[PDB]
Amino acid sequence: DEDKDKDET
Amino acid sequence: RTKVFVWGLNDKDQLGGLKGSKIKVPSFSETLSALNVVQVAGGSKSLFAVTVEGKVYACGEATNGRLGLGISSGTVPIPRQITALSSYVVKKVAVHSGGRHATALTVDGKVFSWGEGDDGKLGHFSRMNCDKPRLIEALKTKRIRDIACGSSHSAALTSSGELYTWGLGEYGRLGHGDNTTQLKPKMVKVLLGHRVIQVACGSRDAQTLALTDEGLVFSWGDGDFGKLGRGGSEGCNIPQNIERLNGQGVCQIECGAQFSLALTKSGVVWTWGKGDYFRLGHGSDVHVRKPQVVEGLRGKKIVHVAVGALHCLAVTDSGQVYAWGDNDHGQQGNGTTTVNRKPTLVQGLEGQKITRVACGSSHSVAWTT
């Protein structure tokens, strides 16, 4: 999805 | 005294000072509860608070100057005051959940803008980023009553009822009868004769919604997934009336990622648009091309609503928060990362007369007053 954030932690 | 609770994604500290990156249960915010907030508002991994005193605080990812603090690269882990606005009493911050820019409205009617400058959404006749809030000169002689921002365009409406739009023109989201980008605020001439009282702005291939003081809802811009609310997928660059909602008493309108939401004075919630990941609340992930009542909230009088990218919050009149949609980062507040296919009571907020909710891209806020 283009609107699903990613967890950069 | 206003208690503020946050949950959801915290990879950039967009929740103002909690340990962890997936806060799956609403958690009391020490810093935010201290400010005495009148509004909280979420952007893309960002968080803004407007206080009774009229000051604005910001935390989260700092890229593109989206927090308006004079920087453009870090994260701001603790909510920090936007000193650039300290000579003003700010009443409202408008930012989209997928948003990298924002606007602030003062009580005397001024509009400032900051953050990512692409396509003119800051309204300053340029595509320049503003690291710090800047007065929107074009509107200095207008008494602005409300503001909104999508990911790529902005809006503001006058006390007399005229709507202004500016930013990316592609797919007709500005409403001026063409697809031209506007670097300054431009009046939506088609809506003259209607007193526009509320406007909402979408993200990416974005829609726009307006609400008049007669309860008529208009929409325009991108038509993908039926977020315009008139069926199929055709877009338009001229505002059209969403007939389904006439006579329904719509009092609030919102735009998430590729879908639309409306709340009525009688407490009913309508949603429509892209259905993936259950953002509409109807229990299946199919697209809904004309507004449909969120059945899972019949009998509950919703008094405030908020949308993020893929999730929604609704507040009942007895202070209960219901959530639905995607849960990759815990933004549902159901203690897990399991999607809420339906409106689902939010956890950990009992004994709290919650009055207001807000959402960023992947995070959630609920506060009292």
Residue type, B275: G
Which neighbouring-strand residues pair with B42?
B47
Instruction: Tokens for B41, please give them.
Output: 């508002």
Q: Is B84 helix (H, G, I), strand (E, B) or coil?
A: helix
CB contact under 8 A, A4 and B326: yes
Q: Is B364 helix (H, G, I), strand (E, B) or coil?
A: strand
Return the residues preceding each gap in chain B, C–N over 2.5 A, or none: none
| Residue where the block lists tokens 């320049």 | B128
Instruction: Tokens for B230, please give them.
Output: 């008139």
| Residue where the block lists tokens 């809006």 | B155
Nearest by CB to B21, which of A1, A2, A7?
A7
Locate the domains of chain B by residue range: 1-369
Listed in order, strand segments (DSSP E) in B44-138 are: 46-51, 56-61, 75-81, 90-95, 101-106, 111-115, 130-135
Mutate to test the interface with A, among B255, B326, B363 (most CBs of A within 10 A): B326
Instruction: Tokens for B210, please give them.
Output: 């307006």
- Way the structure was solved: X-ray
* Maximum separation of any 2 CA atoms in chain B, in Å: 52
Please indicate if any CB of chain A lies within 8 Å of the CB of B328: yes
Burial B146-170 (b: 16+ CB within 10 A, else e): bbbbbbbbbbbbbeebbbbbbbbbb
Instruction: Tokens for B341, please give them.
Output: 């296919």
Binning chain B into helix, strand and coil, the percentages to the nearest 5 are 10, 45, 45
Burial B242-279 (b: 16+ CB within 10 A, else e): bebbeebebbbbbbbbbbbbbbbeebbbbbbbbbbbbb
Q: Are B328 and B308 in contact (CB under 8 A)?
A: no
Q: Are B169 and B220 in contact (CB under 8 A)?
A: no
Please, is B199 exposed, middle or buried when counting C-beta atoms within 10 Å of its C-beta (0-12, 13-18, 19+)?
buried
